[PDB]
């Protein structure tokens, strides 16, 4: 038995809107954060609370961006979001 394409997407949406966990993996997120900070200042140290704060800010920003891009894609009479939708969303909000 195979589910109709789409219903597991809706199940994922519901399951992932009912939860308050964090979706990116901590170790690669921390590695990326340290790499980014390396350019600003070589050989820095990073508090665990600081890196967790960065994750909980970045993921929320991404969620908001995805919601607005979904609104754009729906406006374009679609269900699929696209880089065009992402670009329009950013260019309108001012980023």
């Amino acid at each position: 038995h195979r589910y109709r394409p789409g219903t597991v997407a809706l199940r994922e949406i519901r399951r992932y809107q009912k939860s308050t966990e964090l979706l990116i993996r901590k170790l690669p997120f921390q590695r990326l954060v340290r790499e980014i900070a390396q350019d600003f200042k070589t050989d820095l140290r990073f508090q665990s609370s600081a890196v967790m704060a960065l994750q909980e800010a970045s993921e929320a920003y991404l969620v908001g961006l995805f919601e607005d891009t979904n609104l754009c894609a729906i406006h374009a009479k679609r269900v699929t979001i696209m880089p065009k939708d992402i670009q329009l969303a950013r260019r309108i909000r001012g980023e």
Binding site: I13, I24, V63, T69, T80, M82
Partner: peptide, 24 residues
């Protein structure tokens, strides 16, 4: 390349997206 496709898919599904292009 540490925010993998499953992770971006998780964020998008939290964002209400049903269908996601491969260029997203």
């Amino acid at each position: 390349q540490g925010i993998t496709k499953p992770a971006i898919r998780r964020l998008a599904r939290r964002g209400g997206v049903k269908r996601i292009s491969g260029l997203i």
